[PDB]
Design a protein around this ligand. Structure first.
Ligand SMILES: [Cu+2]
Length: 170
């Protein structure tokens, strides 16, 4: 269990009350857990941000103004997870929406570039309670986008899904 605390994920911003009417996830942003195997398997289209758990379906809403967006620059960024339970880990992956994705429609695999812009494969090692990855957000993205951070667990069928709402500039 864990969440991306910086830049604050959509679920974490629900706990901080930067996002409103998120439902149960406000009280458990670390628990956005579904099956691993994304994108070949994993949470169904339209239900990625919720990890396809019905109680988190508020996170599957998508309008241009629904979610509070962090104003980030492209290029070097840092993504920091807070882990409330440090599970044997397969990988951490970071995906970003395609340049011409539609912020008014549900998030699907077609919304995202399915090649993650960076990936860290831990080989089952136990991570620390705070994990930070440094990657370059692609420069060809501008304006409103969603970054999907995915944590694949090595010794279960599960993964944690952390959508992050961003507004990108040079
Ligand atoms: Cu856990």
């Amino acid at each position: 269990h864990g969440y991306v605390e910086s830049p604050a994920s959509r679920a974490y911003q629900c706990k901080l009350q930067l996002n409103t009417q998120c439902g149960s996830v406000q009280y458990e942003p670390q628990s956005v857990e579904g099956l691993k195997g994304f994108p070949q398997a994993g949470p169904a289209d339209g239900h990625i941000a919720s990890a396809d758990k019905s109680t988190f379906f508020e996170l599957d809403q998508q309008t241009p103004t629904r979610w509070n967006k962090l104003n980030l620059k492209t290029g070097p960024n840092s993504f920091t997870w807070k882990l409330t339970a440090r599970h044997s880990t397969t990988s951490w992956r970071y995906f970003i929406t395609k340049p011409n994705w539609d912020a008014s429609q549900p998030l699907t695999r077609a919304s995202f570039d399915l090649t993650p812009f960076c990936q860290f494969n831990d080989g089952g090692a136990i991570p620390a309670a705070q994990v930070t990855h440094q990657c370059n957000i692609p420069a060809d993205r501008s304006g409103s986008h969603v970054i999907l951070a995915v944590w694949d667990i090595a010794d279960t069928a599960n993964a944690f899904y952390q959508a992050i709402d961003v507004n990108l500039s040079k």
